[PDB]
Amino acid sequence: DLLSCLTFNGVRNHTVFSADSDSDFNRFLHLSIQNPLFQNSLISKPSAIILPGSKEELSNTIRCIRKGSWTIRLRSGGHSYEGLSYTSDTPFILIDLMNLNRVSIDLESETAWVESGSTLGELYYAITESSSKLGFTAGWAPTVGTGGHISGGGFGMMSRKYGLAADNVVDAILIDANGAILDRQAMGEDVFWAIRGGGGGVWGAIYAWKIKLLPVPEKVTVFRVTKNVAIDEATSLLHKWQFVAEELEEDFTLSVLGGADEKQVWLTMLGFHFGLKTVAKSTFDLLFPELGLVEEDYLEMSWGESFAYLAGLETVSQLNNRFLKFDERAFKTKVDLTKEPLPSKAFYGLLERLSKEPNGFIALNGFGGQMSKISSDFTPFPHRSGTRLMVEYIVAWNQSEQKKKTEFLDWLEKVYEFMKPFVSKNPRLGYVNHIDLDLGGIDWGNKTVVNNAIEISRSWGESYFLSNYERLIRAKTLIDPNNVFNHPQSIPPMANF
Numbered sequence: 001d002l003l004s005c006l007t008f009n010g011v012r013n014h015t016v017f018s019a020d021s022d023s024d025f026n027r028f029l030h031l032s033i034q035n036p037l038f039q040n041s042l043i044s045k046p047s048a049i050i051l052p053g054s055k056e057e058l059s060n061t062i063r064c065i066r067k068g069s070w071t072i073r074l075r076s077g078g079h080s081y082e083g084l085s086y087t088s089d090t091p092f093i094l095i096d097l098m099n100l101n102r103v104s105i106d107l108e109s110e111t112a113w114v115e116s117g118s119t120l121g122e123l124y125y126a127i128t129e130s131s132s133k134l135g136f137t138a139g140w141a142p143t144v145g146t147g148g149h150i151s152g153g154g155f156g157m158m159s160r161k162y163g164l165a166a167d168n169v170v171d172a173i174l175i176d177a178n179g180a181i182l183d184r185q186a187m188g189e190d191v192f193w194a195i196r197g198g199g200g201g202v203w204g205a206i207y208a209w210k211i212k213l214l215p216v217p218e219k220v221t222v223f224r225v226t227k228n229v230a231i232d233e234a235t236s237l238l239h240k241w242q243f244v245a246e247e248l249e250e251d252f253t254l255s256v257l258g259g260a261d262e263k264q265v266w267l268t269m270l271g272f273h274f275g276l277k278t279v280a281k282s283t284f285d286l287l288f289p290e291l292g293l294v295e296e297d298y299l300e301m302s303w304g305e306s307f308a309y310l311a312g313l314e315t316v317s318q319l320n321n322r323f324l325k326f327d328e329r330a331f332k333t334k335v336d337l338t339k340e341p342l343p344s345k346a347f348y349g350l351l352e353r354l355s356k357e358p359n360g361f362i363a364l365n366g367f368g369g370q371m372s373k374i375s376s377d378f379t380p381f382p383h384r385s386g387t388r389l390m391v392e393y394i395v396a397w398n399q400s401e402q403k404k405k406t407e408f409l410d411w412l413e414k415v416y417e418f419m420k421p422f423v424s425k426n427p428r429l430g431y432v433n434h435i436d437l438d439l440g441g442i443d444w445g446n447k448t449v450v451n452n453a454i455e456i457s458r459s460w461g462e463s464y465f466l467s468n469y470e471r472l473i474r475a476k477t478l479i480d481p482n483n484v485f486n487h488p489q490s491i492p493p494m495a496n497f
């Protein structure tokens with residue numbers, strides 16, 4: 001019946017479930033699974049996969065699926081930390097957006113229309129090919145999809161200068177539960193607000209984003225330097241880092257990746273300056289001479305080169321390859337936001353725990369700059385002025401280490417518990433792109449839970465959105481009153497008597 005409907009509407013790229021591991025079905029399913037944690041045979045699998053190739057095909061796919069009792073799952077880049085783009089407890093149809101990867105750059109307006117299956121890498125590549133003086137603010141990872149990423153905000157190395165990806169969206173096409181094709185004018189300002197950070201898989205299917213392209217100099221300066229030190233020095237480096245990072249002028253970003261193994265600690269310092277190396281080095285010589293950076297550490301390159309470089313890619317060309325796997329290890333990750341400086345002992349204890357688990361690592365970013373100049377309700381992402389750091393904890397492993405899975409997860413749980421007193425509280429804050437089901441989830445098939453969905457969902461909802469939660473609920477009720485777009489942590493609509 002679904003097939004018949006799709007055909008009647010001219011949607012032809014559809015593949016039904018197959019038990020054949022070599023089937024095209026399995027191939028399409030796995031192409032965009034970015035967390036191996038959700039690849040095994042015990043995981044839920046879609047009853048069919050649809051690859052729409054135009055806005056009409058996307059609209060008609062939604063309309064046809066609704067005539068059945070299927071749960072809709074949308075996938076862009078497949079980076080969901082919890083696999084929420086390609087898993088469901090209820091029978092589901094996977095709408096994979098990989099064929100919707102057209103990027104149209106308008107150099108006369110310095111804007112771009114970006115189909116929602118496009119990855120960050122594809123977008124960055126298109127921009128740098130078009131111009132040496134334009135860039136865009138989003139995350140570091142080139143295989144992340146614009147569909148999920150911009151829907152949830154999108155933080156990166158230029159956010160201290162330009163905010164989130166979603167903060168630079170000026171129009172969008174949203175396909176709603178009825179298949180309506182809505183631009184900013186059609187959807188209204190509440191829904192246009194909601195989609196710019198309120199989370200993917202909740203409002204409808206974004207077909208395309210219209211973004212403002214942003215000025216960058218023809219040469220920027222970056223560094224990527226790993227310090228191999230002991231815990232005393234590593235602790236003093238991280239403790240000073242937090243102040244340097246949040247306080248730097250907006251034209252600078254300094255972030256850190258860290259890990260350890262017994263007495264050996266490694267800290268990778270990632271630096272970005274919107275300008276030339278003389279100014280970059282003068283600034284860090286003054287503010288953070290403890291890093292011991294030398295002239296040869298500072299590299300001048302184009303903006304496009306800088307984003308490929310910071311992502312650990314070999315070439316700018318690699319930005320344009322959506323299936324170049326970033327890691328291929330199963331992982332679990334959690335995140336904290338902070339409001340008060342971290343005491344030295346927090347870094348010391350964090351490093352002690354990393355030293356006991358070499359499969360763990362941390363990623364540290366400062367806010368401030370433009371992030372403090374954007375109001376908390378400009379878009380749904382609320383963590384602006386007053387927010388100091390974002391702190392990510394990751395544990396990752398390969399197939400040969402699967403037996404240790406339980407141990408790895410226990411380690412991560414204990415790290416998060418250790419950090420509790422030092423980070424944001426009441427509530428402990430989060431970030432919707434860093435979706436975390438440990439916070440809880442709604443079973444939309446459970447009547448008693450659904451009756452109390454607003455209060456239950458406040459647990460994660462207020463962590464992700466703070467006071468923006470209420471306006472999000474109103475927007476959800478307007479655009480998807482029947483809850484066609486849902487997942488364990490989707491914004492609840494209000495139900496009528």
Ligand SMILES: *Cc1cc2c(cc1C)nc1c(=O)[nH]c(=O)nc-1n2C[C@H](O)[C@H](O)[C@H](O)COP(=O)(O)OP(=O)(O)OC[C@H]1O[C@@H](n2cnc3c(N)ncnc32)[C@H](O)[C@@H]1O
Pocket residue numbers: 034073074075076077078079080081083084085097116117138139140141143144145146147148149151152153154155156199200201202204205206207326433434487
């Ligand atoms: C995997 C990963 C993620 C990541 C990162 C590095 C890696 C290796 N670095 C990030 C960074 O530097 N800054 C940042 O803000 N986030 C970073 N992330 C996390 C990433 O933002 C999120 O995982 C993001 O949501 C992923 O988006 P993607 O599009 O790749 O993922 P998805 O699984 O397919 O979708 C996620 C959710 O959104 C819904 N979705 C997908 N497409 C649409 C459209 N077009 N319309 C509406 N909803 C959509 C999915 O259904 C799912 O709910």
Ligand SMILES: *[C@@H]1O[C@H](CO)[C@@H](O[C@@H]2O[C@H](CO)[C@@H](O[C@@H]3O[C@H](CO)[C@@H](O)[C@H](O)[C@@H]3O)[C@H](O)[C@H]2NC(C)=O)[C@H](O)[C@H]1NC(C)=O
Pocket residue numbers: 012013014031051098099
């Ligand atoms: C449904 O969509 C999928 C995914 O886009 C289609 O598969 C893709 O088809 C294109 C065109 O055949 C393939 O590109 C080709 O690649 C070869 C190298 O193998 C290259 O030499 C050609 O220039 C050509 O571009 C592409 O590989 C393939 N992608 C995947 C992931 O399989 C599929 O054809 C569509 N199905 C239907 C029924 O329309």
Ligand SMILES: COc1ccc(C[C@H]2c3cc(O)c(OC)cc3CCN2C)cc1O
Pocket residue numbers: 140255257310311312326327329330331333363392394396
């Ligand atoms: C190259 O610089 C960076 C590298 C990694 C990160 C953290 C990144 C991450 C990196 C991985 O490799 C990975 O798989 C195991 C999982 C995760 C999920 C969290 N995510 C955001 C941030 C960076 O700035």
Ligand SMILES: *[C@@H]1O[C@H](CO)[C@@H](O)[C@H](O)[C@H]1NC(C)=O
Pocket residue numbers: 446447448449
């Ligand atoms: C609904 O959810 C509640 C709380 O999670 C659970 O106790 C109960 O068993 C569920 N009810 C049904 C009928 O599944």
Ligand SMILES: [Mg+2]
Pocket residue numbers: 020021022023
């Ligand atoms: Mg076979």
